[PDB]
Amino acid sequence: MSALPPVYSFPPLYTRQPNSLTRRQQISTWIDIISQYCKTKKIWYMSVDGTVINDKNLFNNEDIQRSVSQVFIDEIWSQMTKEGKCLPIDQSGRRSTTTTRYFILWKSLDSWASLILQWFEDSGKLNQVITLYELSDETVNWEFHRMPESLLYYCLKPLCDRNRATMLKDENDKVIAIKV
Amino acid sequence: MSALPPVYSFPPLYTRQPNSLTRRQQISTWIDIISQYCKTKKIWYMSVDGTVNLFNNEDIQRSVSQVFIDEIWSQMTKEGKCLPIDQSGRRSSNTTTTRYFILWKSLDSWASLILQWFEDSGKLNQVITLYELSEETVNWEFHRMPESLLYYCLKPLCDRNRATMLKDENDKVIAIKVV
């Protein structure tokens, strides 16, 4: 129960800082604000310009009348990407081939992998075949509930490695369900 | 969460901001940094100048002006995030407040957690001292809290008629019973 910080309204933050050292910190702060934000609002996608997609822009502070330059924002993303805090995706899968938006990873993919895997066991379904769609129905209500399927797919992949699961695709080789 | 946020190293923060609006936020950010710091390092006292220090960033080579710091404290005091005290107990600004009791947890809040322990330990009728309350049965967030400050968290219990305090020959609260 938190979302946006008090520093989120501190102007000097929106101004990029000339200084390898400083900028390095300032960016972390932003990285951090992002995760915390998406996390509490249970959001998953962020457009490169900061727009939030809903299963509303975080770099444009209306109240403070300030906005982070795209130039900086980009620095923010890469940095966040280098750190594994976000995932570059295009009109669908992992791409940073015209990456259009980001999958904010406040929880590692492997981490999500576990929590989902967990669910499966903590619900005995550890042998059945459930779809990704139902993965986000009434039965689910762990942090990952409502997570897009495309992104859900990336959280399950870890289960395919670690040989704990097998995915099932439809006629158009699209993952639709999975058995763990 | 560490003792210091990433913003703790963001210079612009140490510079006071000319602006009722802005400063107001900047201060909250500092208030916040303090609580969070003290909380995780399980610290309780902070000297007005910041000695825990926390206002003098060595790595960043930057330090908040006392002027600002004072604004920080009052603001933090208005909010009830801290408690002003002289070498003794609660003591107002001028009235020689020498240090602060950082309230990362409201007094009423602490009040509850302590009350809680009592019930969660059935001792809800006995007479335990503040010393034992701080120093081998206690291990909730309040474990190790100074007695003087512990006293202020129990007071709420005297109000709400849930407890009675017992002082020694030198009218010093030593124990308490919170039936």
Residue numbers in the entry:
A (entry chain A): 1 to 55, 73 to 113, 116 to 155, 158 to 201
B (entry chain B): 1 to 52, 74 to 156, 159 to 202
Relevant lines from the article:
Here, we report the crystal structure of full-length yeast Vps25, composed of two homologous winged-helix domains. Vps25 consists of two homologous winged helix domains as detected by the program GRATH that are arranged in tandem. The N-terminal domain 1 (residues 1 to 126) contains two additional N-terminal 3/10 helices, implicated in the interaction with either Vps22 or Vps36, followed by the canonical helix 1 and strand 1. It lacks canonical helix 2, which instead folds into a large disordered loop followed by strands 3 and 4 that connects to helix 2 (at the corresponding position of canonical helix 3). Domains 1 and 2 are tightly packed against each other and their C alpha atoms can be superimposed with an r.m.s. deviation of 3.4 Å, confirming their structural relatedness. In the unliganded Vps25 structure, this helical segment constitutes the 1192 Å2 dimerization interface of two identical Vps25 dimers present in the asymmetric crystal unit. The dimer contact is mediated by hydrophobic residues Pro5, Pro6, Val7, Phe10, Pro11, and Pro12, which is similar to the contact region described for Vps25 interactions with Vps22 and Vps36. In the Vps25 structure Arg83 does not participate in dimerization but hydrogen bonds to Thr15 instead of forming salt bridges with either Vps36 Asp548 or Vps22 Asp214 as observed in the ESCRT-II complex. Therefore Vps25 seems to dock as a rigid body onto either Vps22 or Vps36 upon ESCRT-II complex formation. Surface electrostatic potential maps of Vps25 reveal a negatively charged surface within domain 2 that is characterized by a patch of conserved residues such as Glu153, Glu170 and Tyr152.
